[PDB]
């Protein structure tokens, strides 16, 4: 049936544009951060606890576990 | 601490040497950069403090307040960009200068190793706010509002200077570290009672305590949007921070001294929440909600328990963010309608759906919906008050119910129903306003993931 | 919903159907333009019962101020079409 | 709704209104159709006995005990049509009603869609722009001095004229836009 | 798992029954857990082994920080600020350690209650009684200090508690 | 084009210069509070063979 | 900044306190010591004032 009518509604252009822009920038910086975190976790991090060897004094950043924290 | 202070000072020559059409962009970019630098301060220790020098220190009570203060300036610039379009370049630069000076005074106030320096900056914040209120204000009652705001604060804080100089003459120091380490009990004496009153009233009047809160509705309603944002977000927390810093020397006098103020705050939260139910102005309603929240913070500080302090810090941060967002939403409505009356513009969800979503989220956060940090502070303070006395639960529950009631009343009156027919100048919401609301709301939901960052030194 | 888009012809047919089911008025005498008080000799109470019968037939109710000045089937159909936004 | 109200209601209109209310509430009490027909015919018979009464005082005394009797037995939960001011769907679709002026703020990328509709809208705008200037003077010349005495508007009397204050009555959104 | 000490977190031997099917009907639980194993546990194990070998390719260490003992508040002069600072820091560290000890005991109690099932009221008396002692001690040491707590106030509370105990003992002996 | 965009974009460098100057001033003020370096009773430590100061 | 705050190193010393508490409870359970002690400071080093009332 060719009874298609017009739906009067406010402009959804600006709302959609703002949402797209916000998502674009958030992802623009979050995707590299997530990729870097994943690579660091798989390849490098998660040190294991040890005893301090006698006669050796560690530096301040050697008392932490996660590599990004160090 | 100078790595934050010096860029804030350099904001002034950068603003005054900027092009006529590049002040806002440069100010926003450099304010955001300054805020990023401030993030480093959050790392805090379970031990004493971050004592940078003899003049300034940082603590996990001062760090969230400093971060919020640095974060607020770009939002205030974004909000002020609109209504100052037809203003001369010199006056816009003067407005930005006032905002920068206020930020600098607040930043130096929150570190403040010594109490007279704290008083000096705590009073220096009074001038830029007064100029902003009484110069860039729309109505004719801005002059009376500024007079009230000035004189309430000064009448409250003048005895504090005498109390501080007397304390330094007797003890010998006003450095907070020495004050904490060499603290001595206060004997129950009339002179000690009046010293307690002089130390407490200056911070009470700026909370505002119920019965001394008259200046706040005037100042908030008559101020421009940036002034309302800063007053609701940071300037109210100065009294709470000062009380938290100064209640170390008021013991054991505080145990019985606190009763008049505890009763006033406990009944005044109910009074102001009920006032919010019958209000024809958005800004007045938001201001009275702020009064209720700050009264509950006063109760928390007066109880003086670790859970009280953690809840008070969390509630201060959450209330600052929520009140700023609510004021921004009200200003977005006002710049379209030019009325500032709840019942005029109705059914705005049909015309502005995303702004209605922002309204809903802001109302839910003000309603203290879990697991938001608003409810974290609310619940910690409620538990501490219950441990103080099991009968407080009635007043706390009444306040919670009335708070939900007027929050949803404000949401429904403006967003739901039928649109006003004769209003036809409601243009689509700009990207600037949407970004302002997003930058208000996202930090709250990110902070609820790491509540330990805003729970203060007693965590 | 699944409601067929009723037209002016359907409204007129239904109004005339309900009117012809009204024993007080003879079927032959009535016409789309036939008046109620003068052309068919009906009382005002008969008019209000006719309005109620229309209301029960079409499933919506007409305010009294509008109903009390609906005196012909043609203007009844026009009122119903205006209320329900009928195109043709 | 559409018709302008009068300064007062006459006795005859009040009697009709009571008759309609009583019939509706009797139908609400009597669910079944045959019982309702019987009791409605009995109601009409009781109702038209005093049809031919002449003096005003006894007529005014009547309809009053009738209203009191109606209020005593008014069926505190009467049947209501769904779209009525008390129905279960009175304002269900009022959230889907958008004004016509909202289309003036559409982005040109949005107005690229539906070009014929916007051309027709522009034609309507031109028609309204001329008709309003005609209507202002027409209403100024037709209104009685000292202000209107009723909220009833006159029709158009010339050839190219349009009825005064027509734009917001013709351009209603719809009953069920969505 | 070696990642935590079994003595700090004791567990019963966890004796479990053996499957004793009484009927010939094949139960669905075994088939579902076998298909779960095949479709879930094997790829997860393979990925874990790959990540573990990648970690073993790059190994480095971190150490627990050791803190020396310093004079406490009871042997500091009235206005000596340096020893007061050191004693306050030491007391704060001890307070944190005591809080974590209470946390460990509470975790033990919760685990016992969940593990013992319907007989928790009898089979978890030991954990409840340990928690009673630890809570009593912790309460004596730090309750009612207030928001502005310090080593001096704790020492004053301990002093008044010992004065009360000495007075009670003297009155009881001389009764 | 250099020497033209500088006249309009010279202002941008100021906030950053302030930050590095503030860091330098913080370190300089730190330099004046070394009265107890490697003298605290908790972190009293013997120097490394190539160590002059425990911290800077 | 959110990622930076998420990965802040433990200057509040939480896991350090966990390890200290774990080793102390291991030592005390093994030696028969009754866990935590009621007195925070050893009574030998406090000189109470004699009442003589
Ligand atoms: C509005 C939005 C605003 C956003 C603002 C910006 C964000 C701000 C916050 C950022 C904070 C980031 C952060 O702190 O990370 C946390 C944290 C960081 O990890 P970490 O603690 O440093 O590392 C822990 C260990 O040290 C190390 O662990 P590990 O080495 O064992 O782990 C291995 C490694 C990698 O692991 C693996 O590779 C394997 C793991 C799965 C293997 C499964 C099997 C697969 C193999 C089988 C199939 C294929 C092979 C077989 C094929 C044949 C099959 C037949 O782990 C990861 O890489 C995790 C990556 C997480 C990335 C997080 C990045 C955060 C970005 C922040 C901004 C984000 C913006 C949005 C965009 C983000 C991007 C979308 O990441 C997580 O917490 C992950 C959460 C996992 C949840 C699991 C489900 C829980 C559900 C429970 C509830 C259920 C009921 C309800
Ligand atoms: C529950 C888990 C969810 C997992 C999925 C992840 C979701 C990510 C959301 C991120 C935060 C939202 C940002 C706020 C502004 C929204 C932006 C927007 O405009 O949307 C446009 C976008 C596009 O739609 P459109 O057609 O273009 O716009 C037309 C209109 O806007 C019309 O739009 P509309 O009609 O659809 O309404 C907009 C929508 C969105 O607006 C909102 O109201 C969402 C915000 C609700 C929170 C309100 C504050 C209360 C305190 C919560 C704080 C916890 C946050 C956790 C961390 C968050 C990290 C950022 O509002 C609602 O749908 C009603 C919200 C009422 C929900 C009440 C339940 C809250 C407590 C639940 C517990 C959460 C933690 C679980 C803990 C236990 C289990 C582990 O729509 C959406 O994407 C909706 C957002 C997704 C719904 C979120 C609902 C729950 C998520 C809360 C935060 C994540 C929880 C983490 C746990 C995960 C496991
Ligand atoms: C207006 C909106 C709110 C503004 C803020 C209001 C908060 C300010 C209220 C001040 C708090 C109380 C002040 C003093 C409290 C001490 C307790 C005392 O009042 O109670 C009795 C005191 O008895 C009598 O009250 C004596 C005082 C009588 C004169 C005071 C005037 C009473 C009403 C004045 C209220 C005016 C407030 C506003 C000023 C503009 C106890 O008897 P006593 O054991 O012997 O004294 C104990 C104290 N010692 C040990 C130092 C001796
Ligand atoms: C929109 C439709 C949906 C799309 C999105 C789908 C994806 C859903 C994901 C969104 C939320 C789901 C919940 C998932 C949570 C996982 C992340 C979480 O684990 O990280 C948190 C970490 O989050 C951060 O800590 C909190 C964010 C920082 C908030 C600071 C605000 C940024 C500055 C802005 C100005 C400040 C204004 C306010 C002043 C105070 C907590 O981590 P934590 O267990 O702890 O330890 C981290 C790992 N360690 C052990 C290595 C250390
Ligand atoms: C929003 C408006 C609120 C305004 C503030 C209201 C409270 C003001 C506080 C009282 C004013 C004086 C403060 C005292 C200054 C501190 C100095 C001090 O504590 O030393 C006392 C000094 O105490 C005093 O002298 C107090 C005298 C009070 C005179 C001024 C009266 C002002 C009004 C008092 C009543 C109202 C106070 C509460 C107001 C409630 C809120 C409106 C002891 O002095 P000495 O002689 O050295 O030691 C005794 C042993 N020889
Ligand atoms: C279930 C609810 C309970 C029921 C209780 C209700 C009790 C109602 C009984 C009251 C009976 C009466 O009419 S009360 C008597 C009041 N007085 C008169 O009726 C005088 C003249 N009558 C008129 O003018 C009428 O309009 C008329 C001529 C009928 C139509 O005229 P049209 O030619 O313009 O249609």
User: Among candidates C44, C46, C63, C62, which has minimal Cα distance to C54?
Assistant: C62
Q: What residues of B are in the E interface, CB distance below 8 Å?
A: 46-48, 178, 180-183, 247-248, 251, 304-306, 308-309, 458
> In the block, which residue shows the tokens 């010279």?
F10
Give backbone dihedrals phi and psi of B51, rounded to 5 degrees, phi first.
-85, 95
Chain A hits for G8, Cβ within 8 Å: 69
**Contact indicator for E12, G26 with CB cutoff of 8 Å:** no
Q: Is residue C42 part of a domain?
A: yes
Give backbone dihedrals phi and psi of B438, rounded to 5 degrees, phi first.
-65, -40
Q: Which of B191, B204, B215 to mutate to test the pocket of ligand 5 (most atoms within 8 A of CB)?
A: B191
Q: C-alpha distances in angstroms, B115 versus B120, B161, B245, C69? A: 9, 10, 9, 84
> In the block, which residue shows the tokens 């009621």?
G38
Nearest chain E CA: its distance from A67 CA (Å): 10
**Contact indicator for B234, B142 with CB cutoff of 8 Å:** no
Burial readout E16-37 (b: 16 or more C-beta within 10 A, e: otherwise): eeeeeeeeeeeeeeeeeeeeee
Residue B59: which residues within 8 A CB-CB, separation 6 or more? B44, B49, B50, B457
Sign of the dihedral through C-alpha D28, D30, D35, D40: negative
Q: How far apart are CA G19 and CA B202, in angstroms?
A: 45
Record: contact A21-B351, CB cut-off 8 A: no
> DSSP characters for B153-164?
HHHHHHHHHHHH
C-beta of B221 in contact with ligand 3 (< 6 A): no
Chain F hits for E67, Cβ within 8 Å: 42
Q: What share of chain F is helix, strand, coil (3-state, %, to 5)?
A: 45, 0, 55
Chain D hits for A13, Cβ within 8 Å: 106-107, 109-110
Structure tokens at B332: 């977005």
Helix, coil or strand: residue C86: coil
> DSSP characters for B33-77?
HHHHHHGGGG---SSS-EE-SSS-EE-TTHHHHHHHHHHHHHHHH
Structure tokens at A27: 């992802």
Is chain E in touch with chain C: ≥3 Cβ pairs within 8 A? no
Identify whether B22 is preceded by a cis peptide bond (ω within 30 of 0). no
Q: How far apart are CA B438 and CA B432, in angstroms?
A: 10
Element (H, E) at B267: helix B259-277
> DSSP characters for B352-383?
-HHHHHHHHHHHHHHTT-TTSHHHHHHHHHHH
- Residue C8, class by beta-carbon neighbours within 10 Å (0-12 exposed, 13-18 middle, 19+ buried)? middle
Is chain D in touch with chain E: ≥3 Cβ pairs within 8 A? no
Selected residue of F42, F43, F45 to mutate for chain E interface (largest E Cβ count, 10 A): F42
- Among left, alpha and beta (phi > 0; psi -120 to 50; other), residue B28 is alpha
Q: How far apart are CA D145 and CA B114, in angstroms?
A: 79
The protein residue with its alpha carbon nearest to ligand 2, atom 78, reads B371
Structure tokens at D88: 């279960």
**Contact indicator for E149, E96 with CB cutoff of 8 Å:** no
**Contact indicator for C73, C15 with CB cutoff of 8 Å:** yes
The full set of domain ranges for chain F reads 1-56
User: Among candidates B440, B449, B425, which has minimal Cα distance to B323?
Assistant: B440
C-beta of D62 in contact with ligand 6 (< 6 A): yes
CATH code, C35: 1.10.1200.10
Q: Is residue C2 part of a domain?
A: no
Record: contact B44-G1, CB cut-off 8 A: no
- List the resolution, Å: 2.7
Q: How far apart are CA B271 and CA B277, in angstroms?
A: 10
Chain A hits for B434, Cβ within 8 Å: 15, 18, 22
Q: How far apart are CA C50 and CA C38, in angstroms?
A: 16
**Contact indicator for E63, A49 with CB cutoff of 8 Å:** yes
Q: How far apart are CA B399 and CA B404, in angstroms?
A: 9
C-beta of B364 in contact with ligand 2 (< 6 A): yes
Q: How far apart are CA B275 and CA E156, in angstroms?
A: 47
Record: contact B418-D168, CB cut-off 8 A: no
Dihedral in degrees, nearest 10, Cα atoms B296, B300, B302, B303: 130
Q: Which residue of D has its CA nearest to A10?
A: D102
> In the block, which residue shows the tokens 């609301």?
B437
Q: Which subunits sit against G, judged by 3+ Cβ pairs under 8 A?
A: A, B, E
- For residue E81, the 8-state DSSP code is H
Q: Which of E81, E96, E150 sits opposite B46 (nearest CB)?
A: E96
Q: Which of B259, B260, B295 to mutate to test the pocket of ligand 3 (most atoms within 8 A of CB)?
A: B260
Number of domains within chain C = 1
Residue C62: which residues within 8 A CB-CB, separation 6 or more? C51, C54, C55, C70, C79, C83
Helix, coil or strand: residue B81: helix
Q: What share of chain G is helix, strand, coil (3-state, %, to 5)?
A: 50, 0, 50
Domain that holds residue C61: 8-84
Q: Which of C45, C60, C69 sits opposite D19 (nearest CB)?
A: C45
Identify whether B252 is preceded by a cis peptide bond (ω within 30 of 0). yes
**Contact indicator for B260, B184 with CB cutoff of 8 Å:** no
Dihedral in degrees, nearest 10, Cα atoms B116, B117, B122, B123: 70
Q: How far apart are CA B393 and CA B400, in angstroms?
A: 10
Measured in angstroms, how far is the CA atom of residue B167 from the centroid of ligand 5?
Answer: 13
Helix, coil or strand: residue E124: coil
The protein residue with its alpha carbon nearest to ligand 1, atom 28, reads A41
Q: Which ligand is nearest to the CA of B261?
A: 3
Q: How far apart are CA C72 and CA C67, in angstroms?
A: 11
Residue G18: which residues within 8 A CB-CB, separation 6 or more? E100
Q: Is residue C33 part of a domain?
A: yes
Nearest chain D CA: its distance from A1 CA (Å): 17
Q: How far apart are CA B142 and CA B133, in angstroms?
A: 6
Q: How far apart are CA B331 and CA B427, in angstroms?
A: 14
Experimentally, the structure was elucidated by cryo-EM
Q: How far apart are CA B93 and CA B72, in angstroms?
A: 18
User: Among candidates B314, B333, B325, which has minimal Cα distance to B286?
Assistant: B325
The protein residue with its alpha carbon nearest to ligand 3, atom 10, reads B260
The protein residue with its alpha carbon nearest to ligand 6, atom 2, reads D22
Alpha carbon of residue B170 to chain centroid:
34
User: Among candidates C58, C53, C61, which has minimal Cα distance to D80?
Assistant: C61
């Amino acid at each position: 049936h060719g009874k298609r009518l017009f739906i009067i509604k406010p402009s959804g252009f600006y709302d959609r544009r703002f949402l797209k822009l916000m998502r674009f920038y958030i992802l623009l910086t979050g995707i590299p951060v997530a990729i870097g975190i994943t690579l660091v976790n798989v390849f490098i991090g998660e040190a294991e606890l040890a005893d301090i060897p006698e006669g050796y004094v560690p530096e301040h950043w050697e008392y932490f576990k996660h590599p990004i924290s160090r | 601490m100078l790595k934050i202070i010096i860029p804030t000072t350099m904001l002034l020559p950068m603003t005054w040497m900027s092009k006529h059409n590049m002040i806002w962009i440069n100010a926003t970019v450099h304010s955001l950069l300054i805020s990023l630098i401030s993030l480093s301060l959050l790392n805090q220790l379970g031990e004493n403090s971050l004592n940078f020098s003899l003049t300034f220190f940082s603590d996990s009570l001062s760090a969230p307040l400093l971060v919020l203060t640095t974060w607020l300036l770009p939002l205030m610039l974004m909000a002020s960009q609109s209504h100052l379009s037809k203003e001369t370049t010199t006056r816009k630069k003067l407005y930005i200068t006032m905002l920068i000076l206020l930020q600098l005074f607040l930043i130096m106030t929150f570190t403040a190793t010594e109490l007279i320096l704290f008083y000096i900056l705590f009073e220096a914040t009074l001038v830029p706010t007064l100029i902003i209120i009484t110069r860039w204000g729309n109505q004719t009652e801005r002059l009376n509002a500024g007079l009230y705001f000035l004189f309430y604060t000064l009448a409250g804080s003048l005895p504090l200077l005498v109390a501080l100089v007397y304390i330094q003459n007797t003890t010998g120091s006003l450095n907070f570290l020495i004050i904490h380490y060499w603290s001595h009990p206060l004997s129950n004496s009339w002179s000690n009672i009046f010293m307690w009153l002089a130390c407490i009233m200056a911070f009470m009047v700026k909370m505002p305590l119920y019965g001394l809160h008259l200046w706040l509705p005037k100042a908030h309603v008559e101020a421009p949007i940036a002034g309302s944002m800063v007053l609701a977000a940071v300037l109210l927390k100065l009294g709470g921070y000062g009380m938290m810093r100064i209640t170390t020397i008021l013991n054991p006098l505080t145990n019985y001294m606190a009763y008049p103020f505890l009763m006033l705050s406990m009944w005044g939260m109910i009074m102001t929440s009920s006032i919010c139910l019958r209000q024809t102005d958005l800004k007045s309603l938001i201001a009275y909600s702020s009064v209720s929240h700050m009264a509950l913070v006063i109760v928390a500080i007066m109880i003086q328990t670790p859970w009280s302090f953690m809840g008070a810090t969390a509630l201060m941060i959450a209330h600052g963010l929520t009140s700023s967002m609510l004021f921004c939403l009200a200003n977005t409505n006002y710049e379209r309608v030019h009325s500032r009356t709840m019942i005029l513009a109705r059914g705005l969800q049909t015309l502005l759906p995303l702004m209605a979503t922002w309204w809903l989220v802001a109302s839910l956060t003000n309603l203290a919906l879990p697991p938001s940090i608003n409810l974290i502070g609310e619940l910690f303070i409620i538990t501490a008050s219950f441990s103080w006395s099991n009968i407080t639960i009635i007043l706390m529950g009444m306040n919670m119910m009335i708070t939900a009631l007027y929050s949803l009343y404000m949401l429904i009156t403006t967003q739901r129903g039928k649109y006003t027919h004769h209003i036809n100048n409601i243009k689509p919401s700009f990207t600037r306003e949407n970004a302002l609301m997003a930058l208000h709301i996202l930090p709250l939901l990110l902070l609820t993931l790491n509540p330990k960052m805003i729970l203060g030194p007693l965590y | 919903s699944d409601a067929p888009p009723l037209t002016l012809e359907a409204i007129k047919d239904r109004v005339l159907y309900v009117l012809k089911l009204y024993d007080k008025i003879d079927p032959e005498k009535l016409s789309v333009n036939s008046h109620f008080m003068k052309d068919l000799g009906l009382d005002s109470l008969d008019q209000v019962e006719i309005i109620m019968a229309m209301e029960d037939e079409f499933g919506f109710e007409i305010p009294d101020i509008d109903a009390e000045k609906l005196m012909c089937p043609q203007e009844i159909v026009d009122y119903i079409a205006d209320k329900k936004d009928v195109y043709e | 709704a559409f018709s302008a109200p009068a300064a007062y209601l006459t006795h005859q209109q009040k009697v009709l209104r009571l008759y309609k209310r009583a019939l509706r509430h009797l139908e609400s009490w009597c669910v079944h159709r045959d019982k309702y027909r019987y009791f409605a015919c009995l109601m009409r018979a009781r109702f038209d006995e005093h049809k031919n009464e002449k003096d005003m005082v006894k007529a005014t005394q009547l309809l009053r005990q009738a209203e009191e009797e109606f209020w005593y037995g008014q069926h505190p939960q009467p049947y209501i049509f769904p779209e009525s001011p008390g129905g279960t769907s009175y304002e269900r679709y009022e959230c889907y009603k958008v004004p016509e002026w909202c289309l003036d703020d559409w982005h040109p990328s949005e107005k690229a869609m539906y070009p014929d509709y916007f051309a027709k809208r522009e034609q309507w705008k031109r028609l309204r722009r001329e008709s309003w200037e005609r209507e202002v003077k027409q209403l100024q010349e037709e209104t009685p001095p000292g202000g209107p005495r009723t909220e009833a508007l006159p029709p158009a009397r010339k050839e190219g004229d349009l009825p005064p204050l027509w734009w917001h009555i013709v351009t209603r959104p719809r009953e069920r836009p969505m | 798992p070696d990642s935590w000490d079994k003595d700090v977190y004791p567990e019963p031997p966890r004796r479990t029954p053996a499957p004793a099917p009484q009927t010939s009907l094949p139960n669905p639980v075994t088939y579902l857990t076998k298909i779960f194993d095949l479709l879930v546990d094997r790829p997860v194990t393979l990925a874990r082994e790959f990540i573990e070998q990648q970690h073993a390719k790059n190994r480095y260490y971190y150490y627990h920080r050791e803190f020396r003992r310093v004079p406490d508040i009871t042997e500091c002069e009235e206005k000596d600020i340096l020893c007061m600072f050191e004693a306050e820091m030491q007391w704060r560290r001890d307070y944190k350690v005591d809080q974590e000890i209470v946390n460990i005991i509470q975790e033990r109690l919760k685990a016992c209650q969940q593990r013992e099932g319907e007989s928790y009221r009898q089979n978890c008396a030991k954990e409840l009684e340990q928690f009673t002692q630890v809570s009593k001690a912790f309460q004596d040491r730090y309750s009612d200090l207030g928001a502005h707590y310090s080593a001096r106030k704790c020492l004053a509370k301990q002093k008044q508690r010992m004065l009360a105990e000495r007075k009670a003992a003297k009155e009881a002996a001389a009764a | 084009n250099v020497l033209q965009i500088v006249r309009d974009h010279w202002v941008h460098i100021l906030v950053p210069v302030g930050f590095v100057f503030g860091c330098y001033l913080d370190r300089r003020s730190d330099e004046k509070l070394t009265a107890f370096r490697n003298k605290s009773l908790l972190f009293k430590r013997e120097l490394r063979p190539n160590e002059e100061v425990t911290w800077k | 900044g959110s990622t930076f705050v998420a990965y802040l190193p433990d200057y509040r010393m939480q896991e350090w306190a966990r390890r200290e508490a774990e080793r102390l409870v291991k030592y005390r359970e093994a030696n028969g010591l009754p866990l935590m002690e009621s007195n925070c400071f050893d009574p030998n080093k406090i000189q109470l004032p004699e009442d003589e009332d």
